[PDB]
Amino acid sequence: KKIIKRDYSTAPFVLEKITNAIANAMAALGHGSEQDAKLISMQVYESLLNNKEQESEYIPTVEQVQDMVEDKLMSSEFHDVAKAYIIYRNKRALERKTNIFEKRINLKPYEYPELNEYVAAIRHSYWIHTEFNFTSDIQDFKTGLSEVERSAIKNTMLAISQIEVAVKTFWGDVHHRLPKPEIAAVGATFAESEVRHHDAYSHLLEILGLNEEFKELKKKPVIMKRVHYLETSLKHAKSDDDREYTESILLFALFIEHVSLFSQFLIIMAFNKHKNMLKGISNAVEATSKEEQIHGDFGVDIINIIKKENPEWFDEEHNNLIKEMCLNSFEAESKVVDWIFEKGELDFLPKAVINEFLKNRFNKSLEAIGLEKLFDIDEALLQETEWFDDEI
Amino acid sequence: EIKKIIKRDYSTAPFVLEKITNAIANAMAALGHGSEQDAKLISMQVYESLLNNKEQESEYIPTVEQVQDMVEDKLMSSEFHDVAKAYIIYRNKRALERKTNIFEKRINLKPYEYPELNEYVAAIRHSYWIHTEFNFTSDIQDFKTGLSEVERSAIKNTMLAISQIEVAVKTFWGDVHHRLPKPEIAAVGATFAESEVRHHDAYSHLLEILGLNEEFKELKKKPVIMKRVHYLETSLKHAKSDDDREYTESILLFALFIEHVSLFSQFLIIMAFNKHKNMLKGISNAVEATSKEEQIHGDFGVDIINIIKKENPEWFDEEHNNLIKEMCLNSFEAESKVVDWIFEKGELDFLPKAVINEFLKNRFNKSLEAIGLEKLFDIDEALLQETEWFDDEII
Amino acid sequence: EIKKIIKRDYSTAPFVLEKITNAIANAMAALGHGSEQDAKLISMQVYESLLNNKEQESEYIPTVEQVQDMVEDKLMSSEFHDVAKAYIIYRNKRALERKTNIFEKRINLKPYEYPELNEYVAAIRHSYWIHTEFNFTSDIQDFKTGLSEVERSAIKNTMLAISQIEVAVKTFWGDVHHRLPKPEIAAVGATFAESEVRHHDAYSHLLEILGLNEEFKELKKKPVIMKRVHYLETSLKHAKSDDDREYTESILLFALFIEHVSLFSQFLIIMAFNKHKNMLKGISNAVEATSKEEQIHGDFGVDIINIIKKENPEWFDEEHNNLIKEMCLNSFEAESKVVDWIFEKGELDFLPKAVINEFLKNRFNKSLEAIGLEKLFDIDEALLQETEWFDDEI
Amino acid sequence: IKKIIKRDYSTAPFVLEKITNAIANAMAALGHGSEQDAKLISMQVYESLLNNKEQESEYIPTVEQVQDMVEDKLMSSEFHDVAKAYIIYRNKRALERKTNIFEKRINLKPYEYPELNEYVAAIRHSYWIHTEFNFTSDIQDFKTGLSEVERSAIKNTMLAISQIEVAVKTFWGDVHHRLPKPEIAAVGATFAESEVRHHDAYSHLLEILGLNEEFKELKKKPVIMKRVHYLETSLKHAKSDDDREYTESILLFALFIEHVSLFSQFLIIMAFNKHKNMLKGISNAVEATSKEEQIHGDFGVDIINIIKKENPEWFDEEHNNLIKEMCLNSFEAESKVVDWIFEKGELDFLPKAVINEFLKNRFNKSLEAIGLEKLFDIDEALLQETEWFDDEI
Ligand SMILES: Nc1ncnc2c1ncn2[C@H]1C[C@H](O)[C@@H](COP(=O)(O)OP(=O)(O)OP(=O)(O)O)O1
Ligand SMILES: Nc1ncnc2c1ncn2[C@H]1C[C@H](O)[C@@H](COP(=O)(O)OP(=O)(O)OP(=O)(O)O)O1
Ligand SMILES: Nc1ncnc2c1ncn2[C@H]1C[C@H](O)[C@@H](COP(=O)(O)OP(=O)(O)OP(=O)(O)O)O1
Ligand SMILES: Nc1ncnc2c1ncn2[C@H]1C[C@H](O)[C@@H](COP(=O)(O)OP(=O)(O)OP(=O)(O)O)O1
Ligand SMILES: Nc1ncnc2c1ncn2[C@H]1C[C@H](O)[C@@H](COP(=O)(O)OP(=O)(O)OP(=O)(O)O)O1
Ligand SMILES: Nc1ncnc2c1ncn2[C@H]1C[C@H](O)[C@@H](COP(=O)(O)OP(=O)(O)OP(=O)(O)O)O1
Ligand SMILES: Nc1ncnc2c1ncn2[C@H]1C[C@H](O)[C@@H](COP(=O)(O)OP(=O)(O)OP(=O)(O)O)O1
Ligand SMILES: Nc1ncnc2c1ncn2[C@H]1C[C@H](O)[C@@H](COP(=O)(O)OP(=O)(O)OP(=O)(O)O)O1
Ligand SMILES: [Mg+2]
Ligand SMILES: [Mg+2]
Ligand SMILES: [Mg+2]
Ligand SMILES: [Mg+2]
Ligand SMILES: [Mn+2]
Ligand SMILES: [Mn+2]
Ligand SMILES: [Mn+2]
Ligand SMILES: [Mn+2]
Ligand SMILES: [Mn+2]
Ligand SMILES: [Mn+2]
Ligand SMILES: [Mn+2]
Ligand SMILES: [Mn+2]
């Protein structure tokens, strides 16, 4: 009575669909007739009937029906039709496969409609800094935070602005190498969120009087070693080779988007969760974290589409490079944290707790692709930042 | 005496003789020929000649460049000939370095070379909308049962015409930073690019809910649409060119004619329909929001063209102005034919083709005039006044 | 009774039944259905059906593909249906992988995919020439105290027209390996590129010694030349394109019309002069040497197009074929105008424009026919016969 | 004043009318002054030049000294506007006369670097095909005439040459993309075709010597993998879109790859024929390849010196330490290739010590050619043993 289609949907069983598929294979070779096709269809039907005998819960698949058609054509006089059927079916199956790097003729239907959720995610998360009030935050600096706390916040703000207050064009340019309408939609939507993040942190540098301090940040050794791993990771961002460009997406989504700013997002939101201070800045950092989580997630999905389509590319040589880069990302981010707390650590958020938080983020990134974790974790120290992931 | 000076930016400032002395002293120090005492002597000569021009002849304010020309003249009249020559060369080199090039990348993020362009990001953030904010329930009812066959055919054709531009992959603005590598331009491009994602989603939804998906796939086979695709593709011929001059022609025709005129006859039809018949409420709200964002898109293009013209005036000769004028006529011919096709089953009493055609002719003239070019069409101000309400709702 | 087999490379080899047995056993091993014993039984059936063909043919020799079709047929007739299906798919997959793609890079240097293309390197090594090998002394004497004003104007214009193409930077052949990344194509590219340096140096020297350097700088302003530059640039529109189908149009128009027809009216004019008037002995020698090298250049391009057509037949539709025929006519119109300009001061009695025009029309038809297209020009066989000596000199 | 030094440093007869006309043209351009005024200014320039000659040090004026003098007299005169316009026009003409190797140009002629045309003439002169040589004697020398030690050394030397030569080589043929000059395009295309000839020659030698199978397996040898590593590192930026990165590739390629990588192997084959009077055919082919490799590296040295002269800022201590670092890595790997060639034993007439000094010296000459200091200490006695090699080339 029913059939499971290729898209896993159920549809009413129509024997004429089997008859016509056989008749078309027959017509293509000039061997057989509508009468012969009807006979073969019945043989296929009688066989399906016998499968409902072994199991009452059985409903045939389109691929099970196809395998059966082929088997009956091999058992018949129409061997040339059987061979042509096998080849034709296999050719259509190969044509139905997707290539993320290849352009398509038609706009609709989408090849990866699940990616449309990323446009909806950013439209939901959409924010402008002008929606927040930084008045309490300015006062927290004037008459509520200690020299040690104010140095840590200043350094954290500067570290976020290093990445955020810049020209960011990776997502906006992703459609040049992944030429899909659904990816272009995501790319454009993410590019604009990067304009909003720039405007937020550029405003915060202004109102906090950190503009001069920001221009001189590039000359700091800790920042130069950070710029070095960031630029190394984006080495192939403009490459014409699809495998080289995949390395850029990988390191960018997994480590840049998902770990580079989160030691800093943690610090600002720690001050707020703990002391109920930095209200406006915390709101802006939380909204950034939410959009950064969406950015990294899309990258993880893109990598998994690439891996599924080109599994050969993901060998031991590739996996050792990712693990090499992951460690260099950690060592550089750990030294950024050391610089943030140059004037002293915070009793409520020590460097040890921040370092476990980073190590874990890097492991989750590795695990998201299908790689084994790189760091051993102190579960007790990690539990101290469980509140962060509950809020994002 | 001399109390004021006109600066390079044409602003006025109090006259300070030490500024002339220091400029001369620095030229002298660079060569090791002359002293502050000699510089002071030359400054006075410059000052005395500046007075001879003022109260003595026409009651003027000297310019920084008139001062510079005078410094050079006194240096040549003095013993410091090597200083005179070095001053001439340094001044000219500083003049060249001071120029902005929209096509060249700059070293530092701040200061911005074109900070006026930042207003376009603010404009789109203000005009920002998603179709999910509107309710198209009444519109679906109007279209399926509430419209006459003449009205329905016109609306269907208008919707299809908007969708052949809007329901497509649009990456021009998102890619503008490749040839115009400025942070402030990159910000505008990204914001405009996302606005096109929203425009696509809106008209794609409208094709779905109005049951026009099948008529949309078959639209490409229509002669009027093929003729439209032809001028649109001709206009974007150099959109991916590596020559800055060729690429400028693409920005020009795209901003001035594609962004400012191609969809506006259709935008006018939907607006006039709601205005007179109080129908197509949701679609009207969506068309109005698209019109506002298209006006912003074309405006940015106009500004970009005027920056390019100011920096490369040689590129904008009579041969290139005749090409724009010709393409403007081809854009009008094709859009006028689109309007004829929209009203194939009959014209609307409240909005005749004659009123639509004057509205288009005027939009094309404003585009030409916005770029310092001569108007192309002669306008009947009476037929044009019938669509004045449209420019009220967009501004 | 079956002693030989035709292999895939069309070579004949002794028939070995164990080769059939092992192919069946590998398909059987891959699925875990059957045994070596079952494979030998299927082999015997295959051998038996091959003999039935020998009964009907005569000295029937099976091909590897006929043996393959037979293996499949016996597997379908047997209990091993899964093995028959897997054999069909594997054989077909292996055949698809064996196909060549001119635009794709290969892993190994040897074996060559197109070894016939190596002949072009040998062809140029044979035709290789430097202008310094010829003597232009008699030519300088002819060009002053030997030619009439009509003859001298024609020669100067012919030389200038040749130089319009030859005295320039030519990098198409040298850059062909970027889009057709084959070692054998890279060899031809480099060899053809150097020949262009030799062609440039030749015509640049002739402009110097004939005192045509000033006339050459002001040739670009001539309407006939601007019209020529227009079709030449249109033809090379996609020469640096990143799309393989667009780039193929550039190779096509370039090899077929630019290389094989653009300079040939001029080559014919100079040759005619040495043949009939017995003059310009040095210049005729260089022109003949260039003609032979241009014929080699266009020929390689024709071979490249035929490889592309064989591999992507879908690309060569009616829309494509109408563009080639459109461009072929524009090439002819522009070249016919060039001939009119060469003879602005008067035609030559031994070589009239009508004879030159039939010569061109025919060259364009041969180009079209070389890539399997229809002959586009109406030919006066009598007027054409007047220049058959040229082709009987390349 | 009888003669003047021109911009190209050539001497020419002094003509005062050349000064008069330059002044008159500056005057004519503004409509300020006359030929009479130009003549007066010319004389002032002449008189001041005369003051530096007969009266001072028997000097010869240069075009730029005459130009500075013209400007000085114009500044001393009433024509301050033409004095200024002269200064600007002279400086504009001087800026236009500057060359940028990375930039295109409107006109084919005149050439910016006409000295580079000599490289096309050099290759046309050195042009050869392997079909011109007779390898009959060589084939038998290899099968039956060589000892086990000698045979192994020749086989390894041939395989080492072929590692570089039997391959697709497109660097020179692609140089015009980043150095877009007609004169560079001419050398590049000429050099690219010579590499096709080199490929055909060593591919034929692998065939006739029965080394095709040993060649396919050569890639798996640790010494060869180590060699491929420095060669690929050196050509890291060969396809880069940055002019400074691409310059590093040209540098390492011309100086070390072209001028040194194959020269130990070229020396082995030459020395063998010289001493043993065997491998006459192969020696002829090797000598012809050595001659064309010397031309290839020389053009590269000239290109680097043009780049250095135009962008001196690029050649700092950080850059120079990288070249010296890469030069040592090239030497280490090449010396390892020498050890592998003689794995079955050294040659009495050509020991590894003599080959190693020969290499060290070649690397020093490369460094010195682009104005860098040497790196290796040389044993002049061991080096003298290979002076015949440089005489042959
Ligand atoms: N509803 C059905 N009832 C019975 N057999 C079916 C049905 N749908 C598909 N099949 C089987 C018959 C053939 O063996 C095979 C392919 O048939 P076909 O008519 O092309 O449908 P389909 O599943 O490929 O979808 P589509 O209509 O989009 O091509 O699947
Ligand atoms: N020309 C033919 N030669 C051989 N078999 C054929 C031919 N035409 C149809 N068939 C058979 C084999 C196919 O699996 C079956 C259904 O046909 P068809 O709908 O065209 O393809 P399909 O179901 O395999 O894939 P798809 O739905 O992606 O088009 O009919
Ligand atoms: N206020 C002034 N009073 C008199 N002369 C002035 C004044 N400002 C500028 N000048 C003249 C003096 C010199 O000839 C020439 C350049 O002087 P300078 O001190 O560099 O100022 P400026 O106009 O270039 O501004 P800036 O501070 O941006 O360099 O302009
Ligand atoms: N090093 C120098 N050599 C020669 N002339 C000099 C030098 N320094 C200063 N001068 C002269 C010429 C300059 O036009 C003038 C003012 O100097 P400066 O402010 O540095 O340049 P400027 O006003 O022309 O341009 P800008 O202010 O835009 O950099 O003084
Ligand atoms: N000499 C032969 N005698 C009989 N059958 C043969 C012979 N050579 C090939 N075949 C048939 C047997 C199989 O059906 C089919 C493929 O067999 P196979 O052993 O792979 O040889 P081949 O022709 O593909 O060459 P290769 O050894 O390079 O793979 O061809
Ligand atoms: N793994 C297998 N699954 C199914 N059939 C197989 C398998 N291995 C061998 N065969 C069958 C089908 C092949 O055509 C035949 C000969 O095998 P094979 O030499 O590997 O391929 P082939 O001769 O078709 O192509 P080629 O020689 O070019 O690789 O044996
Ligand atoms: N032979 C000469 N005798 C005297 N002055 C000369 C001579 N040649 C050049 N000069 C001086 C005069 C002017 O100041 C300056 C430029 O003069 P000019 O006539 O343009 O010659 P040149 O050196 O630039 O060569 P060219 O003829 O190629 O332009 O050089
Ligand atoms: N139009 C002019 N305006 C100002 N000075 C001029 C003009 N024409 C000639 N002169 C002066 C300045 C020049 O240096 C000099 C010689 O003229 P010219 O040969 O044209 O340039 P040049 O010798 O400096 O460079 P070049 O040889 O590269 O052309 O005469
Ligand atoms: Mg189907
Ligand atoms: Mg200044
Ligand atoms: Mg096989
Ligand atoms: Mg001159
Ligand atoms: Mn961000
Ligand atoms: Mn981000
Ligand atoms: Mn839009
Ligand atoms: Mn728009
Ligand atoms: Mn040629
Ligand atoms: Mn040619
Ligand atoms: Mn070589
Ligand atoms: Mn070389």
Numbering used by the authors:
A (entry chain B): 7 to 398
B (entry chain A): 5 to 399
C (entry chain C): 5 to 398
D (entry chain D): 6 to 398
Q: What text comes from the article?
A:
RNRs are essential enzymes in all free-living cells, providing the only known de novo pathway for the biosynthesis of deoxyribonucleotides (dNTPs), the immediate precursors for DNA synthesis and repair. Class I RNRs consist of a large, catalytic subunit (α or NrdA), and a smaller, radical-generating subunit (β or NrdB). Additionally, many RNRs possess an overall activity regulation site (a-site) positioned in an N-terminal domain of ~85–100 amino acid residues called the ATP-cone. L. blandensis possesses two RNRs: a class II without ATP-cone, and the class I NrdAi/NrdBi, which lacks an ATP-cone in NrdA and instead contains an ATP-cone positioned at the N-terminus of NrdB.
Binding of dATP to the ATP-cone instead promoted oligomerization of L. blandensis NrdBi to an inactive β4 complex, with a novel tetrameric structure revealed by crystallography. Each monomer consists of an ATP-cone domain (residues 1–103) joined by a short linker (104-106) to a metal-binding α-helical core domain (residues 107–398) and a disordered C-terminus (399-427). The tetrameric arrangement is completely dependent on interactions between the ATP cone domains, as no contacts are made between the core domains in the two dimers that make up the tetramer. The electron density unambiguously confirms the L. blandensis ATP-cone’s ability to bind two molecules of dATP, which it shares with P. aeruginosa NrdA. The two dATP molecules bind in a ‘tail-to-tail’ arrangement that orients the base of the ‘non-canonical’ dATP towards the fourth, most C-terminal helix, an arrangement made possible by the binding of a Mg2+ ion between the triphosphate moieties. The main interactions occur between the last two helices α3 and α4 in respective ATP-cones. A hydrophobic core in L. blandensis NrdB involving residues Met80, Ile92 and Ile93 in both monomers is reinforced by salt bridges between residues Asp73, Asp76 in one monomer and Lys89 in the other. Interestingly, the dATP-induced tetramer leaves free the surfaces of both dimers of L. blandensis NrdB that are thought to interact with the NrdA subunit in productive RNR complexes, which implies that one or two dimers of L. blandensis NrdA could attach to these surfaces in a near-productive fashion in α2β4 or α4β4 complexes. Two metal ions are found to bind to each of the monomers of L. blandensis NrdB. Interestingly, Tyr207 is found near the metal site at the position expected for a radical-carrying Tyr, but it is not hydrogen-bonded to the metal site, its hydroxyl group being at around 6 Å from the side chain of Glu170.
